[PDB]
Scaffold this active site. Structure first.
Site, PDB file in Angstrom:
ATOM      1  N   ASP A 106       0.856  -1.208   0.000  1.00 13.76           N
ATOM      2  CA  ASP A 106       0.000   0.000   0.000  1.00 13.76           C
ATOM      3  C   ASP A 106       0.884   1.248   0.000  1.00 13.76           C
ATOM      4  O   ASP A 106       1.828   1.315  -0.804  1.00 13.76           O
ATOM      5  CB  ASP A 106      -0.982  -0.070   1.149  1.00 13.76           C
ATOM      6  CG  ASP A 106      -1.949   1.079   1.106  1.00 13.76           C
ATOM      7  OD1 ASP A 106      -2.621   1.150   0.080  1.00 13.76           O
ATOM      8  OD2 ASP A 106      -1.987   1.934   2.030  1.00 13.76           O
ATOM      9  N   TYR A 154     -12.194   9.494  -2.950  1.00 16.43           N
ATOM     10  CA  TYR A 154     -11.992   9.512  -1.506  1.00 16.43           C
ATOM     11  C   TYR A 154     -10.802  10.350  -1.069  1.00 16.43           C
ATOM     12  O   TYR A 154     -10.788  10.833   0.069  1.00 16.43           O
ATOM     13  CB  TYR A 154     -11.837   8.080  -1.009  1.00 16.43           C
ATOM     14  CG  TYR A 154     -10.551   7.378  -1.394  1.00 16.43           C
ATOM     15  CD1 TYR A 154     -10.280   7.039  -2.713  1.00 16.43           C
ATOM     16  CD2 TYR A 154      -9.637   6.989  -0.421  1.00 16.43           C
ATOM     17  CE1 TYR A 154      -9.103   6.361  -3.053  1.00 16.43           C
ATOM     18  CE2 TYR A 154      -8.472   6.313  -0.747  1.00 16.43           C
ATOM     19  CZ  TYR A 154      -8.209   5.998  -2.054  1.00 16.43           C
ATOM     20  OH  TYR A 154      -7.041   5.329  -2.346  1.00 16.43           O
ATOM     21  N   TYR A 237      -1.750  11.380   2.866  1.00 16.89           N
ATOM     22  CA  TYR A 237      -2.522  11.659   1.660  1.00 16.89           C
ATOM     23  C   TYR A 237      -2.405  13.102   1.182  1.00 16.89           C
ATOM     24  O   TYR A 237      -2.702  13.384   0.014  1.00 16.89           O
ATOM     25  CB  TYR A 237      -4.014  11.337   1.904  1.00 16.89           C
ATOM     26  CG  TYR A 237      -4.428   9.877   1.770  1.00 16.89           C
ATOM     27  CD1 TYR A 237      -4.487   9.271   0.520  1.00 16.89           C
ATOM     28  CD2 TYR A 237      -4.787   9.121   2.879  1.00 16.89           C
ATOM     29  CE1 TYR A 237      -4.867   7.946   0.382  1.00 16.89           C
ATOM     30  CE2 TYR A 237      -5.190   7.784   2.751  1.00 16.89           C
ATOM     31  CZ  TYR A 237      -5.224   7.197   1.495  1.00 16.89           C
ATOM     32  OH  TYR A 237      -5.622   5.882   1.309  1.00 16.89           O
ATOM     33  N   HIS A 295      -7.597  -6.503  -0.800  1.00 17.10           N
ATOM     34  CA  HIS A 295      -6.613  -5.490  -0.435  1.00 17.10           C
ATOM     35  C   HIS A 295      -5.702  -5.962   0.694  1.00 17.10           C
ATOM     36  O   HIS A 295      -4.473  -5.903   0.571  1.00 17.10           O
ATOM     37  CB  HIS A 295      -7.336  -4.209  -0.045  1.00 17.10           C
ATOM     38  CG  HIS A 295      -6.431  -3.130   0.452  1.00 17.10           C
ATOM     39  ND1 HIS A 295      -5.431  -2.578  -0.322  1.00 17.10           N
ATOM     40  CD2 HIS A 295      -6.429  -2.450   1.618  1.00 17.10           C
ATOM     41  CE1 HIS A 295      -4.827  -1.632   0.368  1.00 17.10           C
ATOM     42  NE2 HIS A 295      -5.417  -1.531   1.544  1.00 17.10           N
TER      43      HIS A 295
END
Ligand SMILES: COc1cc2c(cc1OC)[C@H]1C[C@@]3(C)C[C@@H]2C[C@@](NC(=O)NC2CCN(C(=O)C4CCOCC4)CC2)(C1)C3
Length: 316
Positions: A106, A154, A237, A295
């Protein structure tokens, strides 16, 4: 098969004044460094640490910065790729480690990618779970690459400090019970999260326990996200600008160290087709593929995971 935290050897390393990093070490042999994803902990490698040690490896599983027992500084700028990657190197230095193998999943996938580009002399070998390497394009702003892929809607809901935080932190037990599931148990749609006002909007009040996790392990994650919060994890992010700019320097460089890309078939966001051309910039890249696999690869299919790595570590 699993790992009892109070049965681990716990290590800590100060890389900068307000910034100490904690990890869990087990085994001897060539040093392997494991870097987790979002929103997780070193604990989510609990099926791979022990198998790896038995293959003859010195395993270091990390609490990435902002998580668990690692430090969670309040400044967003502390979380950009360039700052985190350099701290990995200071990490290796203060242990007498000249080089290492790096394996990320990830977000941790992206970090491991910037090391082989920018510090390949300390990177012995590199591998990623889900996360593909895609060279930046110097003429597409990052906010544009979001327009053309609303599966990533998102990320915008995440950009605003405070908001996304409130949702994930109001009831921690629901959040992880809701998030940590297999594809066919999914209770989220990534479609118009920005518009509907959040993520846990169409999700039942009392989620059931998924098949993959126990009522304990939910408590583990639940208690770790009690000291630090979600501000840290969400800031990974919010540095898209600098990361585009820093990354732009790589143009022309080609990673030439031993490499491996591993895709999962039920990750509907970090989708497999996104890595189709990674061979043009990584000439030596070996590959792996897993099926029925969502995931949370390590938790869903740990045996497939373990076999693929260990066969690859021993190939080169
Ligand atoms: C199926 O439904 C699911 C959907 C998700 C997730 C689990 C799911 O269940 C199964 C979980 C939870 C969340 C909240 C939302 C979403 C995705 C989650 N992960 C994520 O957002 N990771 C980021 C870091 C690495 N990134 C890259 O390296 C490049 C960037 C530019 O090129 C593209 C890839 C980009 C994404 C991973 C974040």
């Amino acid at each position: 098969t699993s790992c009892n935290p109070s049965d681990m050897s716990h290590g800590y390393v100060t890389v900068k004044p307000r910034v100490r990093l904690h990890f869990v070490e087990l085994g001897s042999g060539p040093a392997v460094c494991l870097c987790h994803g979002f929103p997780e902990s070193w604990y989510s490698w609990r099926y791979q640490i022990p198998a790896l040690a038995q293959a003859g490896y010195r395993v270091l599983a990390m609490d990435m910065k902002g998580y668990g027992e690692s430090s969670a500084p309040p400044e967003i700028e502390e979380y950009c790729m360039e700052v985190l990657c350099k701290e990995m190197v200071t990490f290796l230095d203060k242990l007498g480690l000249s080089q290492a193998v790096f394996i990320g999943h990830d977000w941790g996938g992206m970090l491991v990618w910037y090391m082989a580009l920018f510090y390949p002399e300390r990177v012995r070998a590199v591998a990623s779970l889900n996360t593909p390497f895609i060279p930046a394009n110097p003429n597409m702003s990052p906010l544009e690459s979001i327009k053309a892929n609303p599966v990533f809607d998102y990320q915008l809901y995440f950009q605003e400090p405070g908001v996304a935080e409130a949702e994930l932190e109001q009831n921690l037990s629901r959040t992880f019970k809701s998030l940590f599931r297999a594809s066919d148990e999914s209770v989220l749609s990534m479609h118009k999260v920005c518009e509907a006002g959040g993520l846990f909007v169409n999700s039942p009040e009392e989620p059931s326990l998924s098949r993959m996790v126990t009522e304990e392990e939910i408590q583990f994650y639940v208690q770790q996200f009690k000291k630090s919060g979600f501000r840290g994890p969400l800031n990974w992010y919010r540095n898209m600008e600098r990361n585009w700019k820093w990354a732009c320097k790589s143009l022309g460089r080609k990673i030439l160290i031993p490499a491996l890309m591993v895709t999962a078939e039920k990750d509907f966001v970090l989708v497999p087709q996104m890595s189709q051309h990674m061979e043009d910039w990584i000439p030596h890249l070996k590959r792996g593929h897993i099926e029925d696999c969502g995931h949370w690869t390590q938790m869903d299919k740990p045996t497939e995971v373990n076999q693929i790595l260990i066969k690859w570590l021993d190939s080169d």
